[model samples]
Target: VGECVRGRCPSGMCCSQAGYCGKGPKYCGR
Candidate 1:
């Protein structure tokens, strides 16, 4: 993850190459 700015992903999920953020399931540590 590059950096998270407010609601938008700063590095963008597409450019991160480390997998997209906020686009997958939410793991609440259940």
Candidate 2:
């Protein structure tokens, strides 16, 4: 599960607008 707080996201993952971290266009935006 990927969740971020204080701008802390998992490695290779981007924090989504909903505060969830993941790797994809919705998260990584690319």
Candidate 3:
């Protein structure tokens, strides 16, 4: 995981239900 696209997310990021790149929160929480 090093990137996000379409419906994919990176290792350091999180993919929301609507397909989004997030930080250390919600999907990609700490």
Candidate 4:
């Protein structure tokens, strides 16, 4: 699980096996 703060994403853009959760470009190599 993940969490967000005041109008910001604490997890940046990319996470671990969970993947990304933002509003921009995302990359995950396989």
Candidate 5:
């Protein structure tokens, strides 16, 4: 994914392929 492809998830997390935010295995790219 590119640097632009993101939602700035909480806790400094990243966006998953499913286009989700926040923290966790799923949202954090398991």
Candidate 6:
């Protein structure tokens, strides 16, 4: 598990609007 801080995310993961890291539109979708 990871939290996207300062707009930074882990590899293959996306920064969600809620500041969470994951792989999906719910995370990448703005």
Find the candidate with the highest TM-score and give its number: 2
C-alpha lDDT (0 to 100) for residue 7 of candidate 5: 47
On the 0 to 100 scale, the lDDT of residue 4 in model 4 is 26
Highest lDDT against the true fold, candidate: 6
TM-score for all models, in order of appearance:
0.18, 0.59, 0.39, 0.19, 0.39, 0.54
Q: Report every candidate's CA lDDT.
A: 0.32, 0.73, 0.59, 0.37, 0.56, 0.76
- For residues 1-30, write the lDDT of model 6, one tens digit per residue: 267867787766788778887888878786
TM for candidate 6 is 0.54
Clashes of 2: 0
Model 1 lDDT tens row, 1-30: 233334245432322233333333331111
What lDDT does candidate 1 reach at residue 26?
35
Q: Which parts of model 3 are misplaced by more than 4 Å?
A: 1-4
RMSD of each: 8.1, 2.1, 4.4, 7.4, 5.5, 1.8
Arrange candidates by lDDT, highest first: which order? 6, 2, 3, 5, 4, 1
List ranges where model 2 is wrong by over 4 Å: none
CA displacement after TM-score superposition, residue 2 of candidate 6 (Å):
2.9
Q: Give residue 16's lDDT in candidate 3 (0 to 100).
A: 57
Colliding pairs, model 6: none
Off by over 4 Å in 5: 1-7
Write down the lDDT that model 4 would get.
0.37
Off by over 4 Å in 6: none
On lDDT, the stronger of 1 and 6 is 6
Question: For model 2, how does the per-residue alpha-carbon lDDT over 1-30 read when each residue is reduced to its tens digit?
Answer: 277767677667788788877788878773
TM-score of 1: 0.18
